[PDB]
Subunit: 121 residues, 8 copies
């Protein structure tokens, strides 16, 4: 089963980071969420109730990304995957990628970040 | 067998969406289609009749994307995969990705969408 | 005097537009603001009090772009130029460009919009 | 008076070109239109009737770009400027830029084209 | 063994295509080549003779892409994979992707093309 | 008279540069040419003989950019402007911009270069 | 005289900013420098000694951008323009644009900054 | 286990290359590093000590990329993978991609390079 529902390049201004100054100034966090969902019923029915609402997922990601500042991207993604898996039984597995395009790293790069994959139990 | 025929970033202005206002205003839909096709005969012969015509595939996608408005991206992709699989026996499997880069979601992101993979029976 | 202070590609999700459906769904508005300001004193002093604060300007633009929905981009830009000119005497003239990259126009384009230039009286 | 109304990166697939093969195959034409229009009344009133409708302008450009094939970009732009100037008295001057990003020129470049500026008489 | 040597976005102006007009006018062909090669010896030695020369590979691709016009992308890629596999025993497998970003297809898309994977016998 | 004919982002691999190593290795040179030409006759007539051929201009630029290596970008642009002005009486003035996106400068930048404007005598 | 020598998109990681946290964490500063220089002698001679060395200019910009942290972009640009004007008599005027693409401003934008133009006395 | 920590598009100006002239002039090297690391503990704890520090990894890559010039990209990547695997036991495997976007290859392409994957022993 290779069907997926995705939300790409979601950007949020947040205050996460292990560094005091980061928590103070903040920065933009980029988030990609890919959900493993069987979409054949919805493909047949065309009834919005047979699939997972992208809009609702964005709201969940947003509430976590624009909420309380935490130290790690690992913790933010764990909370997002866990939030999506908990509320949608149709999601067989959740992939969350978070990128800091402008972290406190003296250099020239496109971004740094993490990616996790959590199956829905 | 890892050979594929692809059509990337096809853009169509359509009226699909579960929201009345979407159906009224419309938006641009981005579509990626990847077809699993054994291309060694055509690679040998160079005869256009031994492969699947990209132009014809685009026409099929277009007729569906610019046709009657439906609620879901899931339904649009199901119709496209089913249309391609039905008319081309050489296509072993069809992957259809549809992205709404500008859906009615208050936020900053690159796009939202779905992706399905349907083997040709 | 060719010195300027600028804010490029500011993006806001708003509900402006002459069409009911636009007001309902909303869309992203892109805004460029260029201010004619003599920057030699600040270039000499390095004292933030001798120039116009980009951060404060962004806040002004934001309050207007994310506020009450109006029909025209012309009206939004007039309000922004007027807001900036009114609060900063050092701004000799304000240029405001607003782009709707995804208006209700069935077609393929990069964007549509307006640009105004208002001298500070 | 530096106010303008603009339409950027409009893309149309057409068959214009002095070469037979071009007329046969076609290509994408990119068009930028900038109109000199005094926008202060509309900025005051917020009444759509006090400005020039971007949507209507796009329709005009489209009808010319997707219509009968001609030899020159110069002729296409002359027809567009003339069409806009004729129907809108508020347009003091029309600038039309047309780019062939992929003309029959053996080489590597971003595009070739012309730009004209026609005052409204 | 997941090591690879790659050449991305190689662009050549050629005259390939099943349509007479294409052969006459030509267009830009984009080519991506990925070679499966064990790079640990070279990683140890740092001796250029223990790996496959990217420059030589580009020359091979070029000679085929800028040579005699053929009908299919399938045939061009088959010739490239076969050319690389034949001359380099260290290449365990060759992947060739060819994209026509501007084919004679009336529409808006990013590109169309094929991709093949050929193991070296 | 604000009409212009332009060729943007022409790229050529050349060996120009004041440094021996540059002459040996080479690099990509990016060239923009803007010609001041009255395009109203051609806009009226649609006859290719009433304007300046973009294709011919590209050929001229190419012959200079891919020819004998010289030390300066200033000299290359002077030769191009002079070549275009000499062969086309309809060109009232020629602007030539040449960019070295990857010169032997240890740093991070988008490009360095020169731009000249030469009226046709 | 419209000839210019330019350096575009120079990027430096620095610690400038009126905010303590900025000075602590730092960020990338983007700089564009355009110099008004008569390039006809060099265009004639092809002798590097008749023009201004882009490499030397970059070094000057770099020494200022990667040096002591100051509060304002206005001060940094004033120092750069003044440094270039002082060391090169052939530079009739220096334009310096500095952009903070990621300042401590909670929002979505492309960048904020200033631009100054200083004639060489 | 599909969790990863990544650093994308790191750019360094170095002098690596098998050609004398390359070693003399230098060029920009682009590096992507993907680390296979189990991130669930850190996702639970939010304690920076339970994961691998992206900043420290960048420093390692940098020290190798901006250090002594070597002939091959294969050798540079082998040293990086080996450096990361050696210092971090939590890294189960290291993927290093190095791209020369502007090598001494007369042509038009996006880049050439290699990619290696080394499990941590
Ligand atoms: N795995 C992970 N996940 C997160 O969410 C993290 N947040 N930080 C984090 C915490 C504290 C500092 C930094 C940071 O980027 N520091 C950059 C830096 C780190 C280590 C060593 C050097 C540097 S930069 C440097 C080095 C030498 C001189 C001057 C500088 C610039 O400050 C990041 N690391 C994370 N790792
Ligand atoms: N899986 C899927 N597939 C499709 O094809 C869909 N079309 N829509 C769809 C239908 C109705 C509404 C929307 C939509 O994007 N609504 C966005 C939204 C949804 C849910 C909750 C909030 C919001 S936005 C919001 C929230 C609070 C205040 C103000 C707003 C902006 O309207 C999308 N959802 C789909 N899901
Ligand atoms: N100068 C200006 N400023 C603003 O802020 C505006 N907002 N709108 C606005 C208001 C109402 C409708 C639209 C709009 O874009 N409509 C697009 C459209 C307009 C006119 C004619 C045709 C079309 S699209 C079309 C045409 C034929 C068939 C189907 C369609 C798609 O609806 C925009 N126009 C503005 N002009
Ligand atoms: N000012 C202007 N405006 C237009 O609208 C034009 N359409 N064409 C046009 C007409 C006929 C041919 C071409 C074209 O691009 N030909 C390219 C070309 C022209 C002249 C000389 C050489 C070439 S390409 C070439 C050269 C040598 C060998 C092989 C080739 C590839 O065919 C363009 N020129 C225009 N000029
Ligand atoms: N698998 C494959 N590989 C190649 O290398 C190919 N080259 N062509 C090829 C050959 C002949 C024509 C075309 C082409 O793109 N034609 C586009 C087109 C094809 C089929 C049906 C319609 C169209 S476009 C169209 C349709 C209706 C009206 C007007 C038009 C524009 O001409 C491409 N097809 C290939 N397929
Ligand atoms: N106006 C102009 N026009 C041209 O066409 C030029 N070609 N070169 C040119 C000639 C010789 C060297 C270079 C070059 O870019 N050198 C870069 C450099 C120049 C001056 C000072 C330092 C550097 S880089 C540097 C500095 C210190 C240590 C290590 C390095 C890297 O080599 C360029 N300069 C031009 N100027
Ligand atoms: N003209 C100019 N030049 C420079 O070089 C400047 N550096 N700063 C500067 C100094 C201090 C703070 C900031 C900054 O961007 N602050 C952003 C901000 C400023 C003013 C008001 C609000 C904000 S953001 C905000 C607002 C409300 C709640 C939360 C936040 C996020 O901190 C920038 N301003 C400059 N102006
Ligand atoms: N696998 C690998 N890894 C590295 O790190 C390499 N560095 N070089 C390397 C060494 C020496 C030369 C070049 C180079 O790119 N040369 C380009 C070139 C190579 C072979 C054949 C032709 C050419 S370009 C050419 C051809 C004909 C005429 C004129 C030219 C331009 O010089 C690269 N090759 C590598 N391969």
């Amino acid at each position: 089963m290779q069907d997926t529902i995705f939300l790409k390049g979601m950007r949020f201004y947040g205050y996460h980071g292990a560094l005091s100054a980061e928590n103070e100034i903040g920065q933009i966090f980029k988030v990609d969420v890919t959900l493993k969902v069987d979409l054949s019923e919805a493909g047949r029915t065309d009834n919005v109730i047979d699939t997972v609402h992208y809009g609702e997922v964005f709201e969940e990601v947003k509430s976590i990304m624009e909420g309380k500042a935490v130290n790690l991207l690992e913790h933010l993604a764990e909370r997002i995957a866990n939030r999506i898996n908990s509320q949608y039984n149709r999601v067989m597995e959740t992939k969350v990628r978070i990128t800091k395009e402008n972290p406190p790293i003296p250099g020239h790069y496109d971004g740094v970040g993490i990616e996790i994959v959590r199956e829905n139990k």
